[PDB]
Design a protein around this nucleic acid. Sequence first.
DNA 1: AAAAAAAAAAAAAAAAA
Lengths: 317, 291, 21
Amino acid sequence: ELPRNLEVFNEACGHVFGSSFNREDNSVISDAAAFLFKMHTHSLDGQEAKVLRASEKKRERENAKKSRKAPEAGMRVGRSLILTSRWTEYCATCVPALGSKMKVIKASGDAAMIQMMKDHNSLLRVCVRIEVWKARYVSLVALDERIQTLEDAQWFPYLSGDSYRACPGLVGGYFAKKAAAGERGKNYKKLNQTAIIPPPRFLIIGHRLQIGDQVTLRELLASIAWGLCDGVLAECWSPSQGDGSIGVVVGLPLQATGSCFLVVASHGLSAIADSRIEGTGNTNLLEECIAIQKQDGVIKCKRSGKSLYHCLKETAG
Amino acid sequence: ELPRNLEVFNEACGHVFGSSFNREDNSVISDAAAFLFKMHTHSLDGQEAKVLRASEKKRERENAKKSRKAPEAGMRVGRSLILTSRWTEYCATCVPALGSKMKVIKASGDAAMIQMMKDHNSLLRVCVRIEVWKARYVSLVALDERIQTLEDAQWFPYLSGDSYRACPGLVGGYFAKKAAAGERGKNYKKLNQTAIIPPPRFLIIGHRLQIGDQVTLRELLASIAWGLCDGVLAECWSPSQGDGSIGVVVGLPLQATNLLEECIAIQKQDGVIKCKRSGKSLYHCLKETAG
Amino acid sequence: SCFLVVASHGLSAIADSRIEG
DNA sequence: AAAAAAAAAAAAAAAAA
């Protein structure tokens, strides 16, 4: 009925959180996804320690993690999620042992182990996507202190190393910076900062975000952009005639690929990352356009020139 | 009395395309050169199969291409080129067998085969030069979707592996990136994205580009720059009576707030002069001037 | 407060929303 | 001189703050 990824995520969440897992709330789904990502990375208390190449401080931290008691049945997670008595069985069964590599399992040839490893990888990817979307959503109302200049903002979202490894094309941070500054191999993926990520309640159901869906402004914006992206993206929403909290998606932005404004260095000149910015002009900057694909057709919506976070804050006033 | 480098290409083009091979149109020369490059790389239909270490899908594709019927005489290639029945004979004789290496030819000692391989190398070099110029000409009007950041704009032109092997100096692409990532050595060459390539109507006749030569603005720009270079290079071309897509060359650049103050050196009939940069890419400048 | 507006969907980046103009 | 604009983003099976 559903692809492997969503089926495995649903099975894992249902097994670990029982009947307390709300399937229509973004916050609950995000909390469950984050907890599952922590469990599957061998990060919950009472799991195998990471000591392969650990510095003494890391050795001490991992030993303390190992010694501590694991989460007990009925522990409260998030806001309305309660672990069931049978989460330990799921953790012991469906979580690959620390250091497991697909090559070793394939060499062994156990079909069940290969299936479990594939499920674990799919769950890692799905939870990474959900957590990236949640980071975007949080960035719409709460600015991150780390981002203070466009250079820093270029690497949002900031997530752990395993988060970058699972979905290199969406996750930024320290590891994305290191990969970009380092040698770019055959597997290098450029950070697609503004990729479309359907809401968590649609991500686990497979309903791709498209026109006609009834969603909120904040959820849609976190799906198609983040806090500091331009405000014109708010045009992708239209309040309904009822309560108005949940509206309708009318059109989605189009990833611009029309023209390139670079100027490569030649004959002693110097490169220009953007012709408009370095021109010290303002007339063009205030009359830019964004290509929104609507039901009727493409439309050029003039940019508002103010952050999405500030636009939302002003509107809420 | 032309050099063998160009004589071989002229003879090959004639023997392949009959009299339909116009020698005064850049598009015609470029299409003929591309076809000959494919022919000498065994990339056409009904030619040898590159199966030295090919993977399963590549092996199947090579086998299918080998089984696929070869082109027949009179085929229309490009827009104004038609094959001649003699081409097969030419493709039977001048094209070296797949996998042949200069080591084996030299070891054999056959003078005829050695000269054939030297001619093949020269033809490949000429065809790759033509292809690079054609890539620049195309880029000057329509920009590649691959090039989005300065990192990607550093490797233009993007050509296949054979093109890089023939002329590593001018060709970029994926294989140039791989070589750069590998190491730097005596055989390694540094990409020169703005080398002066005479237009194909000038290259096949040894007509070095020089001041006072009638050339279209796009022709000159492609021959001394590409789409994303600085717009100031447009100062090297001056139009003629009613322009009419024809003009003359007045100078050739050297070394083939303050950021916008950078100046380029242009050599004229009198002496070196410094011209202030425009700050807008040649592509955008031409697009805006068009309308 | 931070007034940056990162570039996206072909739009031009802004290092400060207020200073524009 | 030597050696989803007949043929270029999103998701999947390969590789792996």
